[PDB]
Design a protein around this motif. Sequence first.
Motif, mmCIF file in Angstrom:
data_model
loop_
_atom_site.group_PDB
_atom_site.id
_atom_site.type_symbol
_atom_site.label_atom_id
_atom_site.label_comp_id
_atom_site.label_asym_id
_atom_site.label_seq_id
_atom_site.Cartn_x
_atom_site.Cartn_y
_atom_site.Cartn_z
ATOM 1 N N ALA A 14 0.824 -1.198 0.000
ATOM 2 C CA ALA A 14 0.000 0.000 0.000
ATOM 3 C C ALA A 14 0.862 1.254 0.000
ATOM 4 C CB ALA A 14 -0.922 0.008 1.216
ATOM 5 N N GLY A 15 0.346 2.310 -0.632
ATOM 6 C CA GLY A 15 1.010 3.585 -0.712
ATOM 7 C C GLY A 15 0.226 4.695 -0.046
ATOM 8 N N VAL A 16 0.519 5.927 -0.461
ATOM 9 C CA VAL A 16 -0.141 7.125 0.044
ATOM 10 C C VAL A 16 -1.053 7.750 -1.003
ATOM 11 N N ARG A 81 -7.681 -4.541 4.617
ATOM 12 C CA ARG A 81 -6.279 -4.347 4.954
ATOM 13 C C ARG A 81 -5.347 -5.208 4.106
#
Lengths: 100, 1177, 33
Positions: A14-16, A81
């Motif tokens: 996962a990133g931003v 998640r």
Amino acid sequence: AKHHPDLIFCRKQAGVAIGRLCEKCDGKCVICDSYVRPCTLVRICDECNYGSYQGRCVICGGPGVSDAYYCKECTIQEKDRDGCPKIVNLGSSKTDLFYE
Amino acid sequence: MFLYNLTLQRATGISFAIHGNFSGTKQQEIVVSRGKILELLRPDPNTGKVHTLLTVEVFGVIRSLMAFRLTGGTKDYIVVGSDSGRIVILEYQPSKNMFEKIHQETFGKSGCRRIVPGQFLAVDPKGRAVMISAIEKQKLVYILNRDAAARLTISSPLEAHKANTLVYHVVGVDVGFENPMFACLEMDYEEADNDPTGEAAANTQQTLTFYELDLGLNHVVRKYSEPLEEHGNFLITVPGGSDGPSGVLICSENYITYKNFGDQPDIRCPIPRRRNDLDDPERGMIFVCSATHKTKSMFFFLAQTEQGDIFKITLETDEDMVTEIRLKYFDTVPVAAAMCVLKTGFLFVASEFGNHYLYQIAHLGDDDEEPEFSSAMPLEDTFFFQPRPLKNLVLVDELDSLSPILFCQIADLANEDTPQLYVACGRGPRSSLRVLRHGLEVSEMAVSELPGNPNAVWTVRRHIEDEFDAYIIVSFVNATLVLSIGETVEEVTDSGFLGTTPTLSCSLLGDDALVQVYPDGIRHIRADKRVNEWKTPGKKTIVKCAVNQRQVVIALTGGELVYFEMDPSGQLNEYTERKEMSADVVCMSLANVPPGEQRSRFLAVGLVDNTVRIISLDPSDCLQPLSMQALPAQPESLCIVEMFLYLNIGLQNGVLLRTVLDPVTGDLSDTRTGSRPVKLFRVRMQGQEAVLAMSSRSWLSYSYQSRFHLTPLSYETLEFASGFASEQCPEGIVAISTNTLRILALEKLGAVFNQVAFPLQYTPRKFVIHPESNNLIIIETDHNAYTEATKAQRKQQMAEEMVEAAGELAAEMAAAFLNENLPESIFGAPKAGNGQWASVIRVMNPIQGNTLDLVQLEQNEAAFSVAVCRFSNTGEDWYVLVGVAKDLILNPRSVAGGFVYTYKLVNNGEKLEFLHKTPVEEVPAAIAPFQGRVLIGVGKLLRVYDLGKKKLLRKCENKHIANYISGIQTIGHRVIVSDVQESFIWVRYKRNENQLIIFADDTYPRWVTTASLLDYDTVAGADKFGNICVVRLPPNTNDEVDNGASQKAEVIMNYHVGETVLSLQKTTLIPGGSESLVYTTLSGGIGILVPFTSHEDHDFFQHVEMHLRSEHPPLCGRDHLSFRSYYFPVKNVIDGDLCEQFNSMEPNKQKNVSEELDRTPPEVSKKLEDIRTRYAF
Amino acid sequence: ETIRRQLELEKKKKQDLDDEEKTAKFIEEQVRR
RNA sequence: AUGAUGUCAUACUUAUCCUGUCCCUUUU
RNA sequence: AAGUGUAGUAUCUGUUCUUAUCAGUUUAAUAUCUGAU
């Protein structure tokens, strides 16, 4: 997906980045494939959005308009998640539709 | 059974600790992380007192806590690693006093998984990056960067997955704006995973892996890999760059190694040991914790050993490499769990058990006669240590924080009605049987007997600039005296009162002008030698009076009131109206002039006919009524105060009524302060104004984190009260008791409960209450230790060994080892043994602190359970049965034998005598009464024995137990047996046939640690995994009998306690309230579960919880449903801890909750306070 | 339809408030003892 | 008296799906 | 007397093993399959 079981999710880290969904697939859950009860926002992968890959639809794969979110059924089940849910594959759907 | 969770005392134990200027100012703060709650402390630099500046429930499992400070900043962030996969970076908000979530990024799944990061969290020294690593197969590196608006932006993480690599720890390397590096003590497991011979399992050495986060490549890479000689335990980053060199000092079993980067060599230094220490030689030594005092000149480290001896490590550095490691005995400290060396010479040492510690760093470790062992100093042989008391540190304070509450008994062990909570907590030498009592300890600064019949007390200052008290007036029955407060308390007459008779009031009218009121009249004594008197016109007697900052009201008989205004020039202007009340005034109330206003808006007056009325004091409605209020009793007093104000009124009965402050009277609240008159006075404590009580108990109500809360003061009753302040007395109560004076002071503002412990020698197991003697027998048992006789034998053997050295034989030093026994509590308990244990029986006076009886078991013995009960065949001889086991072990290969010493406990319950000594079979862990016989648990066997001549004759046996008898609850006819691995089982004992038969079983298992009989068919039980359940038998339970078993029961209650509970005896707390289940915690928390007595109340609480789950979620990113359903799901449990955030919730959140609930936010506040008032203290 | 339960809900709330007032009075009388 | 076999029809489910493009191949 | 396509499932109709044994693969075991009398 329930509509496309032959699809391969990215499952990347996962990133931003905040993703968006195509107008044709507006509101559709990214994982649950439902149409109601969203809980959390959808996070895109780092490599999943770099230039031409930026601004594409998560599920539809097309140009996005609205910001998508994970379904509450997917959030309560500890499913939101997971890795990057980018549809990397494109097969068994919209393949021969261009021929028609 | 819809229960409501109520946390009475938060967890005092400290699990993680950080120290830094998180407040953004020059002050240094200490961030402590308990099991499920975070705290921020700002202790007094001068006063040396540790005040809980902030305390917030994290609603999660805080696993790691590491600080952060960006380049060029002056305020430190807070990295919060939780059991969830969400990395959180919070920031302090002192302007609002709330922890603000600056950034939150999801990383993985939930639960403390092996592939779940959270087991290790690190922050680099340059503040440019952070790292999160799991137990194995996970490593993420997040990049922090400053924004144009100084917003710390969290960039995407770097993947550093290293398969088959178990990470022992993580630390940050030193880099001066270069490519930063992070070190980790990795261990390979894939090679030994394919070694059936077991050889590759050995020769598997842990290696320091330094991974560099290349800023240009934007990806992590294995920069360096370096094996070590032996496995390590902890790492410490030597600061590099301009300050010190780069490197990582790694501690291992009997070793400390400095192996920096580059071409620097490895420098070794063994861990010292105590000279002639009685510990086991095979037991090594490891670094329990370490801190570093970074200074511009130099840098040192303070490291605590397994024996608590804090050593001072100094890094002797060459021109460009490490020269040597200089160690020195700094001091002797307790078993240290965390250490923080803050500025201003303070060392906060938090222990894994017992009260915290905060010492003053006086000596810098040098300029003493203690030797400095250096890495260059050879040895072959370890440098023996010469321990001594605290020579370089001074204990300034001690943070109580009652931790491991092994047992608990909530009952009126004392002669009082307020029940005391006898709670045992400690670890061997740190034993403490705290008799907690719900109140506040007032430190009696001084007390002096007053003659005659003292009636009232007041304290007036000297002037507006006076930072201390100046005059203290004491109104007797037939006179009034004055005293000058100047560190020389004696008679005083030159104040200007002239009060030869009792006075009705006395205060400071102006900035320095005094205003007195006696039945003769008023007297204004200005700063100069002048006293303007004003007689009372007519025969009306002064009934009462009330002063203000710029106004003064007097109330005579017949409801005839008078007002007086303090002019700007110091003149007292008489009111131009004769305001007549409905009747005579029993009391009046008037607020102080705020900073903006020149006088008060409303003024209260209560009539003798049981009714209060506030009237406008302003000129537009001068002497005009404003709002009435009902009084069901004779008003005893009145008082209004700010904190958003409120109006309080004490009635003639033992109860009082409080309402909101407004142009009219709002809500109503009441609590019995009572069996005495409800007198009230003003006070100022903790920088907040409050009301001090005068009744049977001094209920001192004050604001506690945006919430009113009051407990009584643990002292005698006070007749009159006033505030006192000086250099020696910062803020206290000068009070007049019945023919006595008391200048008391209570700093403990932490509303909870006060306690004083009666320590012991060994660690406790259980408690038994002597009914007739009112005594308490505690089973002090601790494994991995030696007996006192064992210590004597070991000392004699060591003495013979030292004398056999024949060292000029002439060395008369053995007498110093035989005589000088160091303190087991201060200098540590030199205990050891893999199977050696020890037990001690002790009966002590609860009201006293003396051990009325003591008894020692053998050296190879170990106690497990104790109880006291009478025998059916015997008379009133209440025998004390205590079970112990010989040759036991923590490893799965011990049993040897069991013994059940038969204590006599005679001589008015103060004379134990182990006559019989029936031997057991396996490991005994339970003993209880049943039909006069002794039901004991021998492993997987339940033996109902009868007290015989030689041993307890086993009158009946049952072999249906699964694993081991962990708990035995004796019902009137049935018995609840809780196994170690299996859940509870209800077994019926037919006495006619003398046969025990399992009546039913449970569906889901639970590692039961404690149990409680809820009803004739309900049984509650804790869980070793941190759960609390309640099983209720159905009506169709076939009590008559003759997947696993036939009959099964249902789970009626399920809720995650958050901390491992080990005691539950819910009964009746605050007398006059509903009984509830008081539950303890291994982390120092005492909560109370109470039922919802209304379906409407249950629905209201459910709606409140459903709203709070989305409105004010936790900071750790965990969900309430997940935080409550970790081990097993939630079953009819309303988490009141999350409900309490409505008082601390934001105003918009409060309005949203009130809209979703269709009620007022004060309505929700009153509903929440009602449960706490009805079911708790 | 919901208005009927709302009226009944308010009536039940008033009844519970009166019962709580009586219980508080009784507890105060006990504490006075 | 359950079954295996597989051309050839039939009911069903996935809230399956109709403007999808060369925005990217410009190699000699 | 009107539906387009993308993947998968079941119930219908027609056919086949009285081969006695041995060994192997496979099966939970059969079965099926592969070589010899």
